[PDB]
Amino acid sequence: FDELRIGLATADDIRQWSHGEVKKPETINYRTLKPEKDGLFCEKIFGPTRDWECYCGKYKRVRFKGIICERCGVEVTRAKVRRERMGHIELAAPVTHIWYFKGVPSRLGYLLDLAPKDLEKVIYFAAYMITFVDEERRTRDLPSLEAHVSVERQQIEQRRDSDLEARAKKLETDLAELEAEGAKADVRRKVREGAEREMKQLRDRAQREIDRLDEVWNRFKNLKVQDLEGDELLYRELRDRFGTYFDGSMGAAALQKRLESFDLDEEAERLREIIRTGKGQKKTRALKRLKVVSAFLQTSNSPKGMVLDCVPVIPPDLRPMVQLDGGRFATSDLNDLYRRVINRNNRLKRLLDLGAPEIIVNNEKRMLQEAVDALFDNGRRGRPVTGPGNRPLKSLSDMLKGKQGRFRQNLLGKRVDYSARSVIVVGPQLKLHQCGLPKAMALELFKPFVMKRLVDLNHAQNIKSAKRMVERGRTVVYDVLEEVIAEHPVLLNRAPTLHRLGIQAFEPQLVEGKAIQIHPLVCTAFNADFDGDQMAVHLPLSAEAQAEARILMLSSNNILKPADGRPVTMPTQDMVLGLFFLTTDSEGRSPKGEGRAFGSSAEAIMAFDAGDLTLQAKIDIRFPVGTIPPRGFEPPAREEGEPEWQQGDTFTLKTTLGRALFNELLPEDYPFVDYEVGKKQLSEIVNDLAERYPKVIVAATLDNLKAAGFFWATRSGVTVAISDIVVPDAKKEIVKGYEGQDEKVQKQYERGLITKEERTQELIAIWTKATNEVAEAMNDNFPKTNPVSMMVNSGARGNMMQMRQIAGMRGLVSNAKNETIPRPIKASFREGLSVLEYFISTHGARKGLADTALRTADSGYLTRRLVDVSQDVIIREEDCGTERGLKLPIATRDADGTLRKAEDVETSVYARMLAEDVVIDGKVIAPANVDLGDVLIDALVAHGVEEVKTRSILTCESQVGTCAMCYGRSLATGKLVDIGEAVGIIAAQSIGEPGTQLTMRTFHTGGVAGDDITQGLPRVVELFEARTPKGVAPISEASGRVRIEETEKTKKIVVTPDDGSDETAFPISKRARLLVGEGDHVEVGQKLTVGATNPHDVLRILGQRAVQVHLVGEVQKVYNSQGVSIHDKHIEIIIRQMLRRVTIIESGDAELLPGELVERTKFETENRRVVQEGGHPASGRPQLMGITKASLATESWLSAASFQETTRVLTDAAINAKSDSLIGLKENVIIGKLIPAGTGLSRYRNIRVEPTEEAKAAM
DNA sequence: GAGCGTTCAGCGTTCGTTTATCTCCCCCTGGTATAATGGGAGCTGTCACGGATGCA
DNA sequence: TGCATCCGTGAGTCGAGGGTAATAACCAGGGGGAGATAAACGAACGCTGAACGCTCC
């Protein structure tokens, strides 16, 4: 397995594969149910239906295999061969592949200079083509053919003379005869009028005969090849009057002749000349055409593969005529489609054999061509072959396409054995690395292991007897089962699996019932609540696989989210509420026994048990040896004339008993914490522990926090009641005052002084102010000790506006299609809405449910496309060779006489390693090649340096993937990233995981469309696809004087650049709403108006570094608007992938095509060779292209095919004949090989293990 | 030797065998002699994006 | 050269489950495999005892 070469299969190649030929539409005898002879399913060609049995019944036995029975010709072998062996159909008349024509023009290519409308006419028997002309003959014998037409021309003139003479005589005779009789007044005039009408008809006929004769002669003189000829009658006149000079034909046979006579090298030369000297769209037509035709000359394969002579047939097992229970049958649709082409081909042979006309044979050839088209791609032309009428028939390409196609349903994602499923429940008594596994569930998973142990322990005699024992479920099995599951991990998994913490290994543990017990800390990583949520269970089998589940995927080595290095295994609903009550100051209750001194922390618990002391009360408490005091307590000490070291001996401390209890959970070396804990400070110490302490201590401490948190949440006494939710007393008055304020506007609208649209905007603003005022009144009313406020202030769950609409008024509600009602909701859910208030509220509620389902769909699509472009980024080098970094602002917005750090320093500059040292006083503070952390960043801001240059993923110069140093330290582990990690897949998941969480839109459009640029997930998708924004704001090229022209038709902005350079004229919309002053200076980087900057022009003018800054900054503001935090390295990896290619312009010396994407590294190599060759280098300019476009233009056709396009990529790969080297990730999942990422690397997988000599010496 | 005692023997003597004849329905093909001479028929509304393809 | 049009592609995740319709119709001939009765050999038996030995008077 080294390369998956693909190309065009020629006619001889198809015959070579075949082990026979299908000659009938027969499938199976209706009575015996056995395959027929020389039809579909035939055993002579495909293989024997039963193992080693032939068709006639001779040679049934297994002995004489590998022979051919002389009776029926069946070769005895295994029945499985039917899945491999394939046949072929011979076609009487050639047909043309539906793929290579009838598609996009990058695959058909205009290889013959014919329009698709032209092709439709010729191959479907509606117009002729002149496949060949004897242009030399025509010149040599020209006077003879000229002599024949000239004498032929004479005859019409002689005939015209006589008919006209008779016409002249006829007019003279009838007028004269009538006038002698004189029967009426005007006999001569009426008949002469009739007579001249007859002359006109004869004269008109004379025009038809001469002009038709003229028309047939002039088509001779334009008898160039590939000339379509629409009029069938005219062709017959050409053909009958003269043969042996022009050769004409119809259909796919004509095309085959044209490709035979093609001289493709000369066509390429003339196409190159047009590219060398051409203008307008004429150059582009030659440019696209060059792409297809050049591929044919370089490749050995001939173009004749377009027109197939023999149709291969799928092996019978892949299109099964399976018996169905109940005596019915089940057949695959390929049989029906294969039946039609066999039927129509067979009839064509009959029609050709006897003498038949052209009309009848053409219709059969037309139907044969249509039948083959339906087989390869049903529905690419007209109506599909519906068969039963209820549904389109499946087709060859239909199996290779879409979400349900072979690629995306049976090669990337398969169903698996040794797997299970069940609902999940919460078990608090578990440890972090433990899960409950139901008895019955585990028994069916571990059935092979239980059977092996049952035999060894002699409870079961043999393998079949062991099988029977477990199926019955005898008592002995359960004892054996607990023995075998121990120390054997199982991989839990929830269904959406957005990010890599979706799959986590656990140590199983048997539990009765039928629901998987799970650990409450790990819920948010799975995103699992306990409404009802089935979770799949997989079992790792081999020694390598289960080793991976213990080390890599365990649930205790995954404390930190890889997105931003934030804790994920301390959720907050109950635990955080408990700890908040436990560590809070007095006055939360009656602080009994406060302001006293206690002998030891034990004695305080004694006082608490008696009830004198309370848990939340300030007290003086002593402290045993070894407990570190606060960091600010280290300089001060007790009063003594001697030096003292209070850091690890006795010390009193002003605190509360609860804080003393809480600290005992933390490890002994940890300094004391004396403040109320909340949620933010709680997350901090878990993050602090993960940095400075080993992994085992972090996992153990969380369990202590879980137990203490749950215990005190019970004792905290949070509840809900009708008297707990207290409505603001002031509220009623506040609402009435606004109503009176409102009503004057209503009054002054009745008199017509204000338009309704202006009134709606002014009322919404008035109501919005009202909601804030009643919120403030309510916030003041509530006491800090009540339940509802306590569980929001603590950060447990909920938000302020949610609490507002339970007690205070809900406020304005968004009407359908983003409008506001003028009459907001005045009642609270406690007070109970009215009927009409409830109806209007539904408009927003249902819309939110429908929209949320859509955002999941789009976020899933965004993640999938991101993964393709972001793969092939693997850490494959310890350290890069280079010095180029990126300059980031550590500190900004510094008020006068003080230094203020940057607001987003964590996501931006943390966990990066300095490209070069930093000197401010002439001395290095932070040396180079040191990753930045809390301590180092503090050093730099204290000394006052305002920027830093950190090495980063963009400027990495690694020939394969990215080095470890440029990526900097990872975030899920807090150490330098390991070699072989797949940073690419990690980055894609991190961007896509909070996509569902975004859900942001303009609150109200205001009645204007286009003023507000795309927000949220559409904006993210727009940024990553390189799409020009909906609201586009132009960019200044350089300095100069700018001014505005307010033309009536449309607005306009014209800027006169300084230094005499060429004028530049910018257009704008009529509602431009610009902001720059008139006749004033402009700079290079500013944007002229409000909107969203176009990423392409920022690349064009500013530079590659600037567009990197722009893209990372733009997408981050979407995320930071909500509250999610993604470290900039994750963004940077994807943006690195977009800038990789380069667009070549003026491709004279590089010798490849102009104006197509080419990767940067190949461009550099080709230029280096050409200057070595003496030729001047070809230029290139950087080009940014979307994640979709970047993914498709990859070297590996197999990975590209497994992406969105599965026809175009297959079609052009066949033309280009691209051998797929199998290096990569997606394509190594298709074949079943080991992915080059992590343990699959050459370096990690090839190691060897031997003991030491001292180990052998002992035993 | 008497009288009967075991056991090859080759030889008949038809019965053993498999192997040769010979009589029968599904299955395929061909043929009807007034005159008869261009389909029914099922649709249709997502959404954005882009690039080919037509045409003023 | 620009503007107008249509065509192709993609659009989440795991759960639950099995059947679809309609019009000249016949002798007439005749082939071709699928099931029904006498001839070639050798093996059970068959009396043929005959031809050998095994004990007994």
Ligand SMILES: [Mg+2]
């Ligand atoms: Mg749920």
Ligand SMILES: [Zn+2]
């Ligand atoms: Zn056979």
Ligand SMILES: [Zn+2]
């Ligand atoms: Zn590097």
